[PDB]
Each structure stands twice: as structure tokens, then as C-alpha cells.
């Protein structure tokens, strides 16, 4: 099973591709896309949608695993990030790829064993599961963690 | 001089196309698209984005006029639909102009302080029957853009 993990955002969009099953997984690709506030919102959304559409077309994943956050602070931030989430969901549906949502405690439990693990603990287990020497970008790492979580729930 | 007005929403998306200037406008098209919670969110967004794209491609408007967005997870959900609307406009190369409710009232009604707005929408466009408030709101937005150009 080939899975695209997505750490959703507007200024940063983490994408990580893995392939395997519950017992073993192979790293395929990861990246953190960025957009600039000086671009207007429509162009930021167009950039994310275009780059994600290209990656979906190229790698042909069987499933998308997306983070289901309960972040509840600022409505103006939530409106902007919701716009990015909408365009991400749109790209997946246009590709015919089903989306499975996972909360952070599900990720921590699947990758570390417990739901109160630290992020550094999760990234250590991402790198160990995939044989990655270093992961500098936390959004890419989180995206890979989501992809590995879907493989564990399948 | 051709404006697509958009009343943004997930369950209801009002669309209204007019052409003209401050003095005279002609009606071209209106609808209220609907989506149901029985569909998963990505499918709802795909349907709205597809139907909006088709209308932008067909009628080739010069501008889009959208209702200005004046709880956090509510904001987040409203944003999902707004994002796909903004994306379709950007892909079409059509500039977006946002207007608030008071701007619509002043542009359309002499009072400037929805029955009065709807009456003025129907009168300006020669529309006898306008039953859907979202489609009416979208037409009111398109007419507001003409008044501000």
C-alpha cells in the first residue's frame, strides 16, 4: 500500500510518501511546500493545489492520511488554514484518492506505542521505521508519521 | 463589464452573472448550488469547484464579486468552501473583489442602511421571480461591483 501523508497548512504544507504494510515500510519522498504572505491568498492556494496535484499524478498513492487537529484559538487563522485544507481535500478527490484522518494521539500511539509521546519521540520512530538518517523539517516528518499511521491502521 | 457574484457556502453556493455598468445591467444567469452532509467533505468541495469552474469557463467574466467574511472550527469549515471558490477564480485568471453587506445595501438601495435589496435586484435585471436568497445575494454582489467600478 502506497500512502501520502499530509501535514496541512497554508504557509507550510508537509507531504510524505511511504509504501508498505503494518510490518515494513519504505520511504519514497518527502517535502515541505511553502507559500508567501506577500502572495495573495488565491495564488497561495493555486500554488499548493498545483504542486499537490503534480505529486498525486506522479506517485499514484492508494490513500491519503491527513492530520485531524483540534487546534482552537483564532478564528482569523482558522479561516485561512481552512482554505488551504479545502484545496488539499479537493486535489485528493480530483485524483480519486480516499482521505483518512488521524488525530495526533492516534499518530503517537501507532508510532511510539503511547498517546502522550513527545514530537521528538515520534520523529525518532519515523526515521527508524524508514531508515532516514536525518529529518530537518518537522512538517515533512509529521507528514511521514501520518502515512506510517495509516499503514498501522490498515 | 461582466461580473460573477458569489454568495459563498458549503450547503448552498449562490452564483449570479450580470453584465453592464452602473446605469444599466443585463441578467445572464443565476443558480444556487447545493451539497448535502450525506457526501464526504472532499466530494462536496469537488462538486462545488467543478460547477463553479464550468460557469467561469463558459461565461468568461471580467471580475468576481464575493461576500466579505465579516467560532474557530466554524471559521475553519467556512474557509474550506471559500478556499475552493478562490482557487477556481485564480485558475480562471479572474480577479476577486469582496464586498460587505452594508456596501451591497448602499449600492443597490437608496437607504444604504433584504426585501429592499431583492426588489432592487429584480428591478435592475427585469427578473419577475427570484425565490432563492443565495442566488439573489449573488446577483446583488455582482450589481454592487458594477456600482463600484
UniProtKB/Swiss-Prot annotation, chain A:
<dbReference type="GO" id="GO:0005737">
    <property type="term" value="C:cytoplasm"/>
</dbReference>
<dbReference type="GO" id="GO:0003677">
    <property type="term" value="F:DNA binding"/>
</dbReference>
<comment type="subunit">
    <text>Homodimer which binds Holliday junction (HJ) DNA. The HJ becomes 2-fold symmetrical on binding to RuvC with unstacked arms; it has a different conformation from HJ DNA in complex with RuvA. In the full resolvosome a probable DNA-RuvA(4)-RuvB(12)-RuvC(2) complex forms which resolves the HJ.</text>
</comment>
<keyword id="KW-0234">DNA repair</keyword>
<dbReference type="InterPro" id="IPR012337">
    <property type="entry name" value="RNaseH-like_sf"/>
</dbReference>
<feature type="active site">
    <location>
        <position position="7"/>
    </location>
</feature>
<comment type="similarity">
    <text>Belongs to the RuvC family.</text>
</comment>
<keyword id="KW-0227">DNA damage</keyword>
<keyword id="KW-0479">Metal-binding</keyword>
<feature type="active site">
    <location>
        <position position="139"/>
    </location>
</feature>
<feature type="active site">
    <location>
        <position position="142"/>
    </location>
</feature>
<dbReference type="InterPro" id="IPR036397">
    <property type="entry name" value="RNaseH_sf"/>
</dbReference>
<protein>
    <recommendedName>
        <fullName>Crossover junction endodeoxyribonuclease RuvC</fullName>
        <ecNumber>3.1.21.10</ecNumber>
    </recommendedName>
</protein>
<dbReference type="GO" id="GO:0000287">
    <property type="term" value="F:magnesium ion binding"/>
</dbReference>
<feature type="binding site">
    <location>
        <position position="67"/>
    </location>
    <ligand>
        <name>Mn(2+) 2</name>
    </ligand>
</feature>
<dbReference type="GO" id="GO:0008821">
    <property type="term" value="F:crossover junction DNA endonuclease activity"/>
</dbReference>
<comment type="function">
    <text>The RuvA-RuvB-RuvC complex processes Holliday junction (HJ) DNA during genetic recombination and DNA repair. Endonuclease that resolves HJ intermediates. Cleaves cruciform DNA by making single-stranded nicks across the HJ at symmetrical positions within the homologous arms, probably yielding a 5'-phosphate and a 3'-hydroxyl group; requires a central core of homology in the junction. The consensus cleavage sequence is 5'-(G/C)TC(C/G)-3' (a different site than E.coli); cleavage occurs on the 3'-side of the TC dinucleotide at the point of strand exchange.</text>
</comment>
<dbReference type="InterPro" id="IPR002176">
    <property type="entry name" value="X-over_junc_endoDNase_RuvC"/>
</dbReference>
<keyword id="KW-0255">Endonuclease</keyword>
<keyword id="KW-0460">Magnesium</keyword>
<dbReference type="Pfam" id="PF02075">
    <property type="entry name" value="RuvC"/>
</dbReference>
<feature type="active site">
    <location>
        <position position="67"/>
    </location>
</feature>
<keyword id="KW-0378">Hydrolase</keyword>
<keyword id="KW-0540">Nuclease</keyword>
<dbReference type="GO" id="GO:0006310">
    <property type="term" value="P:DNA recombination"/>
</dbReference>
<dbReference type="GO" id="GO:0048476">
    <property type="term" value="C:Holliday junction resolvase complex"/>
</dbReference>
<feature type="short sequence motif" description="DNA-binding loop">
    <location>
        <begin position="68"/>
        <end position="74"/>
    </location>
</feature>
<keyword id="KW-0238">DNA-binding</keyword>
<keyword id="KW-0233">DNA recombination</keyword>
<feature type="binding site">
    <location>
        <position position="7"/>
    </location>
    <ligand>
        <name>Mn(2+) 1</name>
    </ligand>
</feature>
<keyword id="KW-0963">Cytoplasm</keyword>
<comment type="function">
    <text>Binds HJ DNA independently of homologous core or consensus sequence; Mn(2+) is not essential for binding but improves it, while &gt;1.0 mM Mg(2+) inhibit binding. Also binds Y-junction DNA less well. Requires a homologous core to cleave DNA. Another study shows divalent cations (Mn(2+), Mg(2+) and Ca(2+), tested up to 5.0 mM) improve DNA binding considerably over binding in their absence.</text>
</comment>
<dbReference type="GO" id="GO:0006281">
    <property type="term" value="P:DNA repair"/>
</dbReference>
<feature type="binding site">
    <location>
        <position position="139"/>
    </location>
    <ligand>
        <name>Mn(2+) 1</name>
    </ligand>
</feature>
Amino acid at each position: 500500500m502506497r500512502v501520502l501523508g499530509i501535514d496541512p497548512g497554508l504557509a507550510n504544507l508537509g507531504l510524505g510518501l511511504v509504501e508498505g504494510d503494518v510490518r515494513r515500510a519504505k520511504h519514497l519522498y518527502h517535502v515541505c511546500l511553502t507559500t508567501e504572505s506577500a502572495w495573495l491568498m488565491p495564488r497561495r492556494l493555486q500554488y499548493l493545489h498545483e504542486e499537490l496535484t503534480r505529486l498525486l499524478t506522479e506517485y499514484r498513492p492508494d490513500a491519503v492520511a491527513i492530520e485531524d487537529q483540534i487546534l482552537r484559538r483564532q478564528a482569523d487563522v482558522a479561516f485561512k488554514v481552512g482554505q488551504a485544507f479545502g484545496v488539499v481535500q479537493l486535489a485528493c478527490a480530483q485524483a480519486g484518492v480516499p482521505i483518512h484522518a488521524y488525530g495526533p494521539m492516534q499518530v503517537k500511539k501507532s508510532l511510539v506505542g503511547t498517546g502522550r509521546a513527545d514530537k521528538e519521540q515520534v520523529i525518532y520512530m519515523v526515521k527508524a521505521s524508514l531508515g532516514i538518517r536525518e529529518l530537518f523539517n518537522n512538517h515533512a516528518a509529521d507528514a511521514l508519521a501520518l502515512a506510517l499511521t495509516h499503514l498501522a491502521h490498515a
